[PDB]
Design a protein around this ligand. Structure first.
Ligand SMILES: N[C@@H](CCC(=O)O)C(=O)O
Ligand SMILES: N[C@@H](CCC(=O)O)C(=O)O
Ligand code: NA
Ligand code: NA
Ligand code: NA
Ligand code: NA
Ligand code: NA
Lengths: 263, 261
């Protein structure tokens, strides 16, 4: 085919993709900064393409509606032919792998627990065995599906509580989870990926922290539509950037170099 | 149908000989994390299989002169095996010539010392000469050093590649033995998974020090273009999501720890 600008679907999720301070003065890809913005640039340079960052319209990662079977989110953008690639903290999962292609992971993570400092909770088991502290997850992403599908007793118990809790314990964006932890005087804990958690505990006012081990072990991948010829080069580029140390540099740059909570 | 030929490697606790194996036959000779994994993948994908220990006992590297692949990788490239189920690192050079599932385990390169050795990091190794150190032959750790442009790692490579006698070993067990027997004068660079397993084994004289040097994964490998790959990769993601991989890990690493809780 002719030369074409690659349409990249991504999500406003700190520190992956953020609005730059002076974004009102800026246009196109220059509006944004963060780990995935830098990662996009690196993949584009290796794979020899021009591209356009496009924030996903509905703000979601991607789930399939059980009634209509329509995919939302970034996954929907690839499934339905709107975008050419997803460069974002998109978890490689079974149900997504059936419908899109994924690179090998560019980051490793697991589900984890965020508390307001001081909350008397150290583990999933501790959340599951009490009722005073509410807890939930992001909508339309892999963490909620983790709970919904777990056969492990403690996780199952947690899903059973979460799915029926009133008011709703689920949040639309990670920022909304963070505010609910910060504002709830220790009466809400948030289940989110260790990568997001670790970032948030580096930001003022330093009132949150990760507790416990991770609940699972998995990875974020760069996604393309099933069968897209871009996949092979993009997967090699990931592995090369991993091997060169560039992914490690990017993680330190966006998580720790400008940390607001010490060390 | 047809029996799937699985290449693997004798590497504790992934594949080990059972007690009394000399009277056993076939797949029943072996036990460990990758034996259990192979069984799970075969069940999910609907195939019979035969485990076969790689003839040359290597993971796989390409000879710079001949461009021939050895090890498990060579098995798959030259058509001797249909799948590899082993702690085989997903790497750029390998990805060019075989297919890989998404990772079934996460790991990084790490440092093993005999307890009390005055080393706490790679940097520490690189700044002295009393304590020798090396890696496995024919694997991803050795390639990591050979190819690194990071100063500390490049410096390590320069030393290792020229050190006399050789600091490289043929098997992980040999590297561990060398650590154990060298009175603190040998440290070994190996994957955090293996390091963690050995520090749970008697005589409890080794330990992992410092952070991991990198972050990567093991995958199930198949020859490039094999029709097994799709189903295998989905099976790894299912076993992951069902918590089976975590259960296998706990069974083979920690259940049997001999060096405390
Ligand atoms: N990374 C997740 C979103 C965050 C979460 O669900 O905790 C996904 O790809 O769905
Ligand atoms: N997992 C490695 C072998 C161990 C090592 O090199 O430390 C490989 O696939 O080459
Ligand atoms: Na796919
Ligand atoms: Na073999
Ligand atoms: Na180390
Ligand atoms: Na499950
Ligand atoms: Na688990």
């Amino acid at each position: 085919g002719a030369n074409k600008t690659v349409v990249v679907t991504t999500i406003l999720e700190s520190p992956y993709v953020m609005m730059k301070k002076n974004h009102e003065m800026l246009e196109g890809n220059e509006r944004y900064e963060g780990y995935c913005v830098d990662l996009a640039a690196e993949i584009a340079k290796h794979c020899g393409f021009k591209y356009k960052l496009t924030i996903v319209g509905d703000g979601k990662y991607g789930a399939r509606d059980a009634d209509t079977k329509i995919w939302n989110g970034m996954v929907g953008e690839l499934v339905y032919g709107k975008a050419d690639i997803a460069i974002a903290p998109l978890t490689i999962t079974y149900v997504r792998e059936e419908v899109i292609d994924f690179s090998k992971p560019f980051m490793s993570l697991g589900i984890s627990i965020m508390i307001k400092k001081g909350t008397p909770i150290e583990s999933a088991e501790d959340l599951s065995k009490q009722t005073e502290i509410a807890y939930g997850t992001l909508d339309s992403g892999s963490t909620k599906e983790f709970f919904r599908r777990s056969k492990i007793a403690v996780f199952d118990k947690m899903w059973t509580y979460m799915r029926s809790a009133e008011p709703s314990v689920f949040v639309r964006t990670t920022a909304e989870g963070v505010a609910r932890v910060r504002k709830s005087k220790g009466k809400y804990a948030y289940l989110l990926e260790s990568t997001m958690n670790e970032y948030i505990e580096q930001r003022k006012p330093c009132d949150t922290m990760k507790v416990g081990g991770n609940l699972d072990s998995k990875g974020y991948g760069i996604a393309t539509p099933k069968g897209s010829s871009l996949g092979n080069a993009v997967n090699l580029a990931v592995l090369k950037l991993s091997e060169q140390g560039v992914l490690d540099k990017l993680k330190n740059k966006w998580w720790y170099d400008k940390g607001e909570c010490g060390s």
